[PDB]
Structure 1
Amino acid sequence: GSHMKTLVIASLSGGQGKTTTAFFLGKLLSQSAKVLFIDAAPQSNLTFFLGHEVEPSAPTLLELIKDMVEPADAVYSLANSNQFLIPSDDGLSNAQEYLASSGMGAVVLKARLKPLSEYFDYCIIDSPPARTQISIATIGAADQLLIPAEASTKGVNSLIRTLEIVQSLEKLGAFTGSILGVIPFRDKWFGLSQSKDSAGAIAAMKEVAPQLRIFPSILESERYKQALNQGILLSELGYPDLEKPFEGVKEALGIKQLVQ
């Protein structure tokens, strides 16, 4: 009955908030929808944060990409009944050349996930940094692309370079989705006033890509890691305001909040 929408979190620079976004957005979406998390990063941060351990001979994203197992076999249930995961471990960097060797790497993951379409409402994919076969393949898989970008000059560059890869993949017919928007990351506020550098970076993001939605920022705050470490939502920790970047995305997806 489902028509799975694949949301890919991409940003080529390191530490731009990709995994933090995948974790919170995915948990939030799972409140009323069936969500398939995919950890596409060889460093395997999301797999760990979602509380999943990979047993020695257990099929991961690697085995799926290499078509060594059926898609449903690399899918594991999580604590929550609306949450599932295709995990990764450090061996995933081996997919790097499998993808290169195919000559169609950018559409391999896209192809591998199609059979899971009617089992889930959303697929959320956490991408690694750097331009590689894996980060290109996650982008190729996207129905909707989300780019977290640090609210700094580094983040603006990440936005720009990420958009360049999408534009190139679109030309070659691998990217057929749309760009949902940009989430500024580590936007620094001093009480009620925004830091000039953060404000300036976001303003620069809008100049770079005038057509893109800029979502509410992931504010510079230790509360995100606090909630993450406890396995809970920012709202559940008592900081609903910090959750608004993700609520904004959810609203953009046309998802209507539950009401009382």
Structure 2
Amino acid sequence: GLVPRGSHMKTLVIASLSGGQGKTTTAFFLGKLLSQSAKVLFIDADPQSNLTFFLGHEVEPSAPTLLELIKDMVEPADAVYSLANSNQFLIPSDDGLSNAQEYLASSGMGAVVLKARLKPLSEYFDYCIIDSPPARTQISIATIGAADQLLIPAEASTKGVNSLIRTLEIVQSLEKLGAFTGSILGVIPFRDKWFGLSQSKDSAGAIAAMKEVAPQLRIFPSILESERYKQALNQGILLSELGYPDLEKPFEGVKEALG
């Protein structure tokens, strides 16, 4: 079972309404860093289920997951699984999580369903980290609804900037309807190309344009373009442990802004 403390769980949602390895990468490393001295609940709200894979969890055949939780087929704790780390837990996802789409649409209140489904767990964790689907979908909107704090990864490219723009309007509209009651923690640009001492004019331009579009948002130091992220992910370890601590700094920076 779950040992309940006196905590009030802060839900942090990694949402970019476009594809790329950024959300999953950020959820994974950020969740692990937070767990160093706090109890962390991971939620893999992506039907690809990469976060579940990279955390080393495999869903057993008839086991209840995020889908059962969303559709209210099970107590919220029955969908929580412990991981190797004593401070990390997971509401996993697998194949037919996209069946939550219809359920959420047809409820008339999809954007607050997940928020409601998670309240029973508030007292058991310090942080909840949600990896959201890489498009605008009912599930994606529900993850945003659930947020106390929203972190927007954005590719350091023209496509990344437009993606950020779409995402901010979706949030703005969820705010007006009373679904989104959190705040935007900031933007973390990723796939920022450097050629040693000098950065790509394209990356530089895109990040510069991100400040123009959202002048009120914090733009975090970027996640460099690097194959190391995927290498650490594949082995289920931190970048510092893999032996590349510098690559871990932008996640540390987000952790800092959370305390």
TM over 0.5: yes
State the alpha-carbon separation in 1 of the partners of residues 98 and 43 from structure 2.
Answer: 15
State the Cα deviation string for residues 177-222 of structure 1 (Å, max 9, x = none).
Answer: 0000001111001102111000000000000001111111110111
8 Å contact from structure 1 (residues 54, 89) kept in 2? yes
8 Å contact from structure 1 (residues 235, 243) kept in 2? yes
- How far residue 230 of structure 1 moved from its aligned partner, in angstroms, is 1.1
- How far residue 226 of structure 1 moved from its aligned partner, in angstroms, is 1.0
What TM-score comes out, normalization by structure 2 length? 0.97
State the Cα deviation string for residues 147-176 of structure 1 (Å, max 9, x = none).
Answer: 000000011011101111000000000000
Residue segments in structure 2 that go unaligned for 5+ positions in a row:
1-5
State the alpha-carbon separation in 2 of the partners of residues 164 and 239 from structure 1.
Answer: 36
State the alpha-carbon separation in 1 of the partners of residues 188 and 174 from structure 2.
Answer: 22
8 Å contact from structure 1 (residues 181, 215) kept in 2? yes
Matches within 5 A, 1:35-184: 35-184=40-189
Q: Secondary structure at the match of 1:102?
A: coil
- How far residue 129 of structure 1 moved from its aligned partner, in angstroms, is 1.3
State the alpha-carbon separation in 1 of the partners of residues 10 and 32 from structure 2.
Answer: 16
Q: Secondary structure at the match of 1:185?
A: strand
Give the equivalent residue in structure 1 for 2:208. 203
8 Å contact from structure 1 (residues 16, 149) kept in 2? no
State the alpha-carbon separation in 1 of the partners of residues 46 and 95 from structure 2.
Answer: 8
Which deviates more, 106-115 or 220-229? 220-229
- How far residue 224 of structure 1 moved from its aligned partner, in angstroms, is 0.7
- How far residue 142 of structure 1 moved from its aligned partner, in angstroms, is 0.3
8 Å contact from structure 1 (residues 223, 234) kept in 2? yes
8 Å contact from structure 1 (residues 8, 144) kept in 2? yes
Quote the RMSD (CA, aligned, Å).
0.7
Change (3 A) 1:11 1:155: same
How many residue pairs get aligned? The number is 254
Give the equivalent residue in structure 1 for 2:220. 215
Give the equivalent residue in structure 2 for 1:193. 198
Q: Secondary structure at the match of 1:69?
A: coil
8 Å contact from structure 1 (residues 99, 105) kept in 2? yes
What TM-score comes out, normalization by structure 1 length? 0.97
Residue segments in structure 1 that go unaligned for 5+ positions in a row:
255-260
Runs of 4 or more consecutive aligned structure 1 residues displaced over 2 Å after TM superposition: none
State the alpha-carbon separation in 1 of the partners of residues 258 and 48 from structure 2.
Answer: 29
8 Å contact from structure 1 (residues 16, 155) kept in 2? no
Change (3 A) 1:121 1:25: same
State the alpha-carbon separation in 2 of the partners of residues 140 and 242 from structure 1.
Answer: 30
Q: Secondary structure at the match of 1:131?
A: coil
- How far residue 13 of structure 1 moved from its aligned partner, in angstroms, is 1.0
State the alpha-carbon separation in 1 of the partners of residues 129 and 145 from structure 2.
Answer: 13
State the alpha-carbon separation in 2 of the partners of residues 37 and 161 from structure 1.
Answer: 25
Q: Secondary structure at the match of 1:84?
A: strand
State the alpha-carbon separation in 2 of the partners of residues 146 and 219 from structure 1.
Answer: 17
State the alpha-carbon separation in 2 of the partners of residues 224 and 92 from structure 1.
Answer: 26
- How far residue 82 of structure 1 moved from its aligned partner, in angstroms, is 0.2
- How far residue 103 of structure 1 moved from its aligned partner, in angstroms, is 0.3
State the alpha-carbon separation in 1 of the partners of residues 191 and 47 from structure 2.
Answer: 24
- How far residue 245 of structure 1 moved from its aligned partner, in angstroms, is 1.2
State the alpha-carbon separation in 1 of the partners of residues 211 and 249 from structure 2.
Answer: 19
Q: Secondary structure at the match of 2:106?
A: helix
State the alpha-carbon separation in 2 of the partners of residues 210 and 244 from structure 1.
Answer: 23
8 Å contact from structure 1 (residues 16, 150) kept in 2? no
